[PDB]
Amino acid sequence: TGCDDPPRFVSMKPQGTLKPSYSPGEQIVYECRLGFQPVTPGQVLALVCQDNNTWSSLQEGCKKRRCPTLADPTNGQVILVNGSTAFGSEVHYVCNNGYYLLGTNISYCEVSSGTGVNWSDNPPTCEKILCQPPPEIQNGKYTNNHKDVFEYNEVVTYSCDPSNGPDEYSLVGESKLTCIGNGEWSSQPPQCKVVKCVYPAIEHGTIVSGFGPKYYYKATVVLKCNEGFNLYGNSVVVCGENSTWEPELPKCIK
Ligand SMILES: *[C@@H]1O[C@H](CO)[C@@H](O)[C@H](O)[C@H]1NC(C)=O
Ligand SMILES: *[C@@H]1O[C@H](CO)[C@@H](O)[C@H](O)[C@H]1NC(C)=O
Incomplete structure (x- = not known):
């Protein structure tokens, strides 16, 4: 009656395409998967539908290829986040303080070659962070x-x-x-x-703080009403950027 279904392997696949059922004596040839390489190169890997209707015993035959190891770029570092340079593993690039990354930070181990493995991207560099002098302004x-x-x-x-x-x-x-x-x-x-604010005046209200001869930018003047009046605006003003009292001057209503 034969052996209809073949077992799937970790590192191998049938070389060609499988048919629904196999009869005794026929064999399926296996080959390394993408990203693998023979464990013992040359050793031919195949299952044979034996005469007992079972599949023969086949040890695992290939092993994950590995991309070349990577050195830390000058003034930075490469991180094997997956713990190896195995196929299908990624590395991260980072730079030390004072340094910025020129290139692609994450590199991938891929079977870009039809045969063989290589990082998807070249390593970046870490370039020292030097910014140019700031512009001088008016005065x-x-x-x-x-x-x-x-x-x-x-x-x-x-x-x-x-x-x-x-x-x-x-x-x-x-x-x-x-x-x-x-x-x-x-x-x-x-x-x-030159930022100067206008002298703060309030009907029926004294200037508690301030008294600066000229109230320059960020000067701060606290104000309160005279006996009997109830404050209506906000007690503390601030000489503003545009020379305007920020917020508005208070009032001292009865
Ligand atoms: C490798 O590490 C990265 C970052 O943590 C993660 O995104 C990825 O899934 C990991 N891959 C494996 C195979 O562990
Ligand atoms: C890597 O750099 C890219 C830009 O080149 C950025 O968008 C990404 O978040 C960075 N990732 C890491 C892990 O540094």
Whole structure:
């Protein structure tokens, strides 16, 4: 009656295509699967429908190929996340602080070749993160203007110039910015401009805090009403970026 069904193997497959039923004496030849290689090259792998209607005994014949081992790129590292360079395993590339990755971070062990295995991508490099000097602004000299390039985390501080005339400047934005990316700084070069707010006045209400001669940017003035009045607006104002009291001035209604 024969042997109708053949057992599937880990590392092998029938070389050609199978028919529904086999009769005794016939043989199925096996071959390494993709990504495998012979355990003992040359050794012919085949099942034989024996005369007892069973399939003969065939040991496992191939073994997972492996992509070449990989070295850590300079200033970085390669991670065998799967614990080997086996076929069907992936590696991750990462760079040390101060360094960015140039290339493809994840590489795959693939049977790109009809015969043989190779990584899907070449290894990246790790390039040091050097960003160019920040732009000077109006009356704004950054530190190390004389310097030509800043490495990672080098920090520049922005200096407002001396007064053009009577009233001095007030540096809007953040004075200190740092080199955090290969071509990136952390903050925009901050505007340095004379910011002064109008003296805060309130009918029936005294100025509790402040009294600064000139209320420059970020000055802060607390205000409260005179005896008998109930506050209606917000007690604390802040000299604004646009020289406007932020928020609006309070009122002191009966
Ligand atoms: C190998 O590791 C990666 C990352 O954890 C995971 O995505 C993948 O499934 C793993 N593959 C194997 C064969 O373990
Ligand atoms: C690898 O880099 C790509 C961009 O090249 C990014 O989209 C991806 O999230 C990164 N993955 C890892 C594990 O670093």
